[PDB]
Design a protein around this ligand. Sequence first.
Ligand code: HEC
Length: 108
Amino acid sequence: TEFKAGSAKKGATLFKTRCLQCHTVEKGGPHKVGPNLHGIFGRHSGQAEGYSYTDANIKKNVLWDENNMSEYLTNPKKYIPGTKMAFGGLKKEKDRNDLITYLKKATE
Ligand code: HEC
């Protein structure tokens, strides 16, 4: 119990400001730099078909829930050294919370 739900609305704007550049959340939404994330929760890293995920991703083989997703979010390259994810992360717990709640919601 190390993840508390923040604001959906809050999350929706970091997502825009911080993940839209390379990602879509919507089912039937496109793969871009990074892959579309619809249905990310419960799935293991590297399973979006039509996306050329680095070796690193695949082998990591992380299960996607709110928690894993918060450390990863703290420092990706650190959670998965190898990852072509060019993102330093999100330093604050609160901001993390917010977006995941956001992610929680839309990728559904
Ligand atoms: C482009 C500059 C990106 C930004 C900004 C963000 N993401 Fe990303 N993401 C990107 C790539 C190229 C990849 C694949 C990495 C690889 O090594 O192949 C990823 C991957 C993810 C994943 C894991 C994918 C999976 O197994 O299905 C997740 C959960 C994810 N990205 C989420 C995410 C969020 C919430 C972001 C905003 C703060 C974000 N990423 C930024 C490309 C880019």
